Enzyme design. Structure first.
Site, short mmCIF file in Angstrom:
data_model
loop_
_atom_site.label_atom_id
_atom_site.label_comp_id
_atom_site.label_asym_id
_atom_site.label_seq_id
_atom_site.Cartn_x
_atom_site.Cartn_y
_atom_site.Cartn_z
N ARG A 192 7.36 -5.24 -1.63
CA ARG A 192 8.74 -4.72 -0.77
C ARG A 192 8.49 -4.61 0.63
O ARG A 192 9.11 -5.39 1.25
CB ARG A 192 9.33 -3.39 -1.42
CG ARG A 192 9.69 -2.94 -2.95
CD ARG A 192 11.15 -2.90 -3.26
NE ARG A 192 11.42 -4.16 -3.93
CZ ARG A 192 11.52 -5.78 -3.31
NH1 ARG A 192 11.72 -5.52 -1.70
NH2 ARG A 192 11.45 -6.51 -3.80
N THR A 193 7.55 -3.86 0.81
CA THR A 193 7.37 -3.56 2.30
C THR A 193 6.90 -4.67 3.17
O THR A 193 7.23 -4.87 4.21
CB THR A 193 6.75 -2.25 2.36
OG1 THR A 193 7.30 -1.22 1.84
CG2 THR A 193 6.57 -1.55 3.80
N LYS A 201 -19.85 -4.73 2.54
CA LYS A 201 -21.20 -4.11 3.24
C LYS A 201 -20.62 -2.72 3.56
O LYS A 201 -20.83 -2.15 2.49
CB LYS A 201 -21.24 -5.08 4.37
CG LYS A 201 -22.08 -6.26 4.24
CD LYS A 201 -21.01 -7.39 3.47
CE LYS A 201 -21.74 -8.76 3.63
NZ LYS A 201 -21.35 -9.16 5.26
N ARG A 224 -0.55 -0.86 6.09
CA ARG A 224 -0.50 0.33 5.21
C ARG A 224 -1.82 0.58 4.61
O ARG A 224 -2.68 -0.48 4.60
CB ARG A 224 0.38 -0.18 3.92
CG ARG A 224 0.57 0.87 2.82
CD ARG A 224 1.43 0.34 1.89
NE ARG A 224 2.74 0.48 2.14
CZ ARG A 224 3.67 1.26 1.53
NH1 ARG A 224 3.24 1.88 0.15
NH2 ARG A 224 4.82 1.45 1.77
N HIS A 249 5.89 7.48 6.45
CA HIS A 249 6.17 6.11 6.49
C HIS A 249 7.48 5.92 7.44
O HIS A 249 8.65 5.68 6.93
CB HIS A 249 6.64 5.98 4.90
CG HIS A 249 7.17 4.75 4.36
ND1 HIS A 249 6.80 3.48 5.22
CD2 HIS A 249 7.58 4.40 3.10
CE1 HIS A 249 6.89 2.70 4.34
NE2 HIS A 249 7.49 3.01 3.04
#
Ligand SMILES: Nc1ccn([C@@H]2O[C@H](COP(=O)(O)OP(=O)(O)OP(=O)(O)O)[C@@H](O)[C@H]2O)c(=O)n1
Ligand SMILES: Nc1ccn([C@@H]2O[C@H](COP(=O)(O)OP(=O)(O)OP(=O)(O)O)[C@@H](O)[C@H]2O)c(=O)n1
Ligand SMILES: [Zn+2]
Ligand SMILES: [Zn+2]
EC number: 2.1.3.2
Lengths: 310, 153, 310, 153, 310, 310
Positions: free
Chosen positions: F54-55, F84, F105, F134
């Protein structure tokens, strides 16, 4: 026959004071004078639809120290029954034609009770059904409380941790509330407190209980400290690391405890009981797990034998 | 046979009249308790004008006498109904319902992890605590819920 | 020695009429007068390279009710042998030095036969090899047909479902075609019909068979209804939901059946047999799964014992 | 008067009487077309003597004129059902159900993979009398099935 | 405004002959003079809930060749939507809040048409929905027949392979039946036959069709030979390989094909068309995939543009 | 140069009232006249180390609507970095070597702010960091309150649902406390209560708030009703369903809401807002998701542009 002969062991709610005492009596005898060919020629099914290594091995070692045979399974990303389409009812209807008893642990509640309606005259024993019940853990806890304290009534029992979702603490309180005069101290994060139903029950019987904020507040009066693990899943990492200056147990905290005070934990004990508690006299969680053998042997012997003259 | 009419309809030759059903519980009761799977004449009156509730519903089933605990499964939905048993045009019997101790098959456990959902068993709830407000415990998962909640879904 | 002593049990094609009757005879005796220390000191390997809970537990319960010991495994996303590089031949060459008999189920066809060339003098018993063979299911089906109908010849047998790929229906027809005068009715979706090879065989022996469109068409004449599951994988959802007004079984459909008509299903029975059939007299699929124990006990006892005087 | 028929009839003033409902489709129709979610007086008769057509059902819905579209939906279930409207104490129109073009809402796609199953959608099928039977094509998955596969599921 | 303006291209049964010819004459113009800025500033969503690389890369390249931006996801690789219980109606009601058209593939049949109920005025173009439709594969196939054969009517078209489950042979037969005097030859193994609903539709329109068991029977007459891949899981290992795997084309079979004959295959081809076929002038499977660019470009141009100057 | 030029939008507690109003008046201008080439030739990275479709689709579409290019990855689906032992400091020191801004995010709280220590002058915009902030969801929420209510002060805002763990109710309450005379009504089950640190901050600023157990208690007075999803794993099955699942909105409850009242929900909504609510004029959850386009466009415009002519 004995009271429990051919009976289904599903809920601690269904076993009276005397049935609990009968079990605990037998377990003390089987601990004393072992009878390794008592279930010679019985086959038990160890159906762990949900995996528990510790519980599965305690049960199967119980089956084997009474000479029984074992067929069964455990399940994570594996072996067929259930799948989807295969009902639990049809699995049990099929396995009830093969075995003499069914020990099962399943993730949905009441699975053991559903099973009872399909196993014919084959007894089924519950080893865990979701968040509902786990009678054989309660049975071994009470055997450990009885052999260390000498009695099962008039105890000052402290219960600690996630009281809201420790299934063993809900059962243990139900069972200790069938004996007389027990006082309960419930030390929980208020996010994780004793449900009102346990408490509502305890007041109808007149039992004394209190809620405290940290173990240090009752260390001086307590006989059993039953520690439960606080479940990081349903807690924010920041909440979890915040509560009080904790509710974990260290030997420093024990300097106050009575000489007969024992610390019990159903296990695993990740971090709420530190390694230095292990060397004190009060540490009894490993001896508690060994008593699982005697409590489970007792239940299997009473269910599958009519009269046990041991 | 005797003068039916329909604001309050008349006489079945022997059978059961569940009268004083609250509005819109009538059909629910026919659905839930499968009362329709008979070859008998059933006559039903819906949204009817009388007995002070004002509007009531009514079911008439000829030649079937459903009773004592059937009448009690009715208690959660239609607690003020009267179940008139009739023989040869006379109400030889009038019962009302009382909370049963067990309600089978008609409810659905609200606990979604309950095993009851998926299987060839029927629901069963232990009933308790009259008119101050009923709690129902599932046979299988042993979770006790408020009857308002099970009765919603 | 008995005919099957030290023999490999791989295909129903390789066991004659008399060998089948011998097994069925023994199984009726072991059901009657159990001998729980007959394979005392034998170790059998339960090698399930492909997982089957129902089949594995029937076999291991068989091994244990004759007193044998069990080592083995099952496999989904797990435990080592095969891996790639490890040949089946080398797994069997290594396990043939450890055990007294090998029961195995494997996903590729002829794996049990390949095994026979590497196990030395250790007998190997096939519990499933791909879509080829499953002798011990056929053996328990025939034991259930013989104990309910009284005979294995002159039966009006109806076979239903995925006849094209039910491996048990191909075997069962091969075996029932060694006895005399049996009439077969094959009710399948034409997408899922009896292969021409079964049919081509049956006509060389002169056996009578017919193909019908729905069970209702033969309900009146039939003695065994052997129901198979229709496999949604190799069917379109829309095709699957379209066929006829189905070929599933409900008690309404049974109102016509003979009193001795029994319904068999190798299981699982997801939805082609409704729950109301379970309560009729004609339902025999769970009793059929219990006879798995007696059929498998018979085979293990004849393979590992020279002379059985039971 | 008497060869019973009526027995002092629920003769209504304005409404819809659906008569000759085939036996057992009677309750089906109330459920499926949600006919009881009204406040007007309904009187239902189930398993009536219809010596003249064996057994029947009949719903009397008052001050309600159920029409055109509504009447045609019932075709799949009660194809011989006469709807009669009543304006002021007698029959004013007496319609018969004819097969419609589309059947919405009431019916489920047989297709387990059809999207209609998991979603906020009202089912819809296009009706085709393929002389012998009626085929129903789903709007969504576009698979066509005999009306008999659909009318179970 | 052109007829397709702002329409949903959900199914081939919704597009008329005239609609089909309009897309195909636009594809031909864009193929000849590019319009690389026509969809400038348009943002299009490419939602592939079921992964399909071939189709995605082609839809997106043709979006890029008319100047549009693309945002989107390929999944069947847990890219977070469908989590919690986000219905498809809700995902499409949030995605149509900011993109100018949705291209979507989804596993259940009917999903594109449901998307249509929630998008408002944002056109939905179907890139495949379960076993139901795939408009844009039928549009590129048609364009490739027209461009190489000069016509879409009076064709002799053979369809070879799995005709029962092949989603694209079923749609191309419905599109070609929109046109005149086409003749069909179906060559399929018995288990993979062309469904009756196609055949019944063909009969009803007076279109001629026939079944043959060998390509050799019909090669001479054939203009378009559309080959489909058999998936071996629709049959069993031994069925696939048995006499039924001879629906495979080799260069030697083209011996006598008309100079104009072309071989078309939606792809992946694994072995039904041997590699030696690629060197022939009749191999047109890759040029067919290349034509997917102009047929998808044309649909996006026609659907997002009121009027189009060509 | 505008105040936000080249800033890192890491947290709502770093943006002032004036900052907030500047983003919100720019969002309103871009919504009214587009500037589709403003970020021409800028390349932006969309790093979603934790997937969130969605974001992502919304951040990227708004990047595309101002003319920027996007490179990037969605992961929690092993797209090779973190392999690694590549620290996040090192990934961001290599990514800021060629992109003009990073949108990211990440699952751990604090990750965006650490990225800031390594990016040089490339702005970092936070699209979510664990249970911490957010900014861009709080900016679109605010824009939707302002656009539908005409103001951001003197509001009566009810917050309903899981208020304890809901990352967005906590931030929108801190943003709204930046403004004047707002009044809060919290309606949450006991286990999902609004945390004390929010309440203590509200008290300290003289803002009024109150707890209610029913939406019906407060509907009449309410301007914005912000609903949150309860995740059932934060409670148990039977808790979720018990009397606590009545934090669900239906159309019938809107009966008496003010004509201006709007229902907002960050989404996915699964059942806390019933589908019949969508037909009401008060349903504004989808128009709220649409507004995410202009609030994210405005932040990218303001952060990458010195001066902005509007
Ligand atoms: N053979 C008969 C006799 C009576 N009734 C029904 O029986 C019901 C009630 O019985 P009755 O005692 O006869 O009338 P009431 O005194 O009003 O009963 P109550 O006061 O309990 O409502 C009425 O609805 C009436 O329709 C009936 O249908 N058939
Ligand atoms: N005031 C009225 C008039 C008619 N009816 C009902 O309307 C239906 C209409 O049938 P009608 O044309 O009056 O005679 P029928 O022969 O029964 O109609 P059909 O040919 O359909 O059987 C009957 O069931 C009757 O009970 C009614 O309830 N009230
Ligand atoms: Zn339950
Ligand atoms: Zn459908």
């Amino acid at each position: 026959a004995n009271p429990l002969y051919q009976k289904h062991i599903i809920s601690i709610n269904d076993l009276s004071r005397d049935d609990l005492n009968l079990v605990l009596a037998t377990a003390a005898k089987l601990k004393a004078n072992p009878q390794p060919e008592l279930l010679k020629h019985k086959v038990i099914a160890s159906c762990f639809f949900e995996a528990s290594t510790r519980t599965r091995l305690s049960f199967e070692t119980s089956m084997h120290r009474l000479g029984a045979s074992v067929v069964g399974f455990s399940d994570s990303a594996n072996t067929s029954l259930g799948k989807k389409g295969e009902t639990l009812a049809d699995t049990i209807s099929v396995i009830s034609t093969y075995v003499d008893a069914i020990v099962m642990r399943h993730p949905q509640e009441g699975a053991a009770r559903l099973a009872t309606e399909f196993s014919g005259n084959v007894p089924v024993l519950n080893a865990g059904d979701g968040s509902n019940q786990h009678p054989t853990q309660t049975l071994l806890d009470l055997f450990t409380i009885q052999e260390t304290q000498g009695r099962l009534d008039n105890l000052h029992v402290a219960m600690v941790g996630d009281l809201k979702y420790g299934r063993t603490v809900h059962s243990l309180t139900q069972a200790l509330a069938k004996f007389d005069g027990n006082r309960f101290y419930f030390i929980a994060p208020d996010a994780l407190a004793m449900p009102q139903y346990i408490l509502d029950m305890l007041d109808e019987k007149g039992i004394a209980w209190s809620l405290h904020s940290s173990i240090e507040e009752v260390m001086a009066e307590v006989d059993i400290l039953y520690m439960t693990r606080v479940q990081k899943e349903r807690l924010d990492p920041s909440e979890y690391a915040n509560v009080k200056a904790q509710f974990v147990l260290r030997a420093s905290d024990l300097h106050n405890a009575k000489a007969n005070m024992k610390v019990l934990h159903p296990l695993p004990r990740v971090d709420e009981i530190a390694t230095d508690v292990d060397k004190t006299p009060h540490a009894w969680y490993f001896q508690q797990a060994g008593n699982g053998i005697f409590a489970r042997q007792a239940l299997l012997a009473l269910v599958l034998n009519r009269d046990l003259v041991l | 046979m005797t003068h039916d009419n329909k604001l309050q309809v008349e006489a079945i030759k022997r059978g059961t009249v569940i009268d004083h059903i609250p509005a819109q519980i009538g059909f629910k009761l026919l659905s839930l308790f499968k009362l329709t799977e008979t070859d008998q004449r059933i006559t039903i009156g819906l949204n009817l004008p009388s007995g002070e509730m004002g509007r009531k519903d009514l079911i008439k089933i000829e030649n079937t006498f459903l009773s004592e605990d059937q009448v009690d499964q009715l208690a959660l939905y239609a607690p003020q109904a009267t179940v008139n048993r009739i023989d040869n045009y006379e109400v030889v019997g009038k019962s009302r319902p009382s909370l049963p101790e067990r309600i089978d098959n008609v409810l659905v456990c609200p606990n979604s992890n309950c095993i009851s959902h998926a299987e060839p068993v029927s629901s069963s709830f232990a009933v308790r605590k009259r008119a101050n407000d009923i709690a129902l415990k599932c046979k299988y998962c042993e979770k006790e819920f408020s009857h308002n909640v099970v009765l919603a879904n």
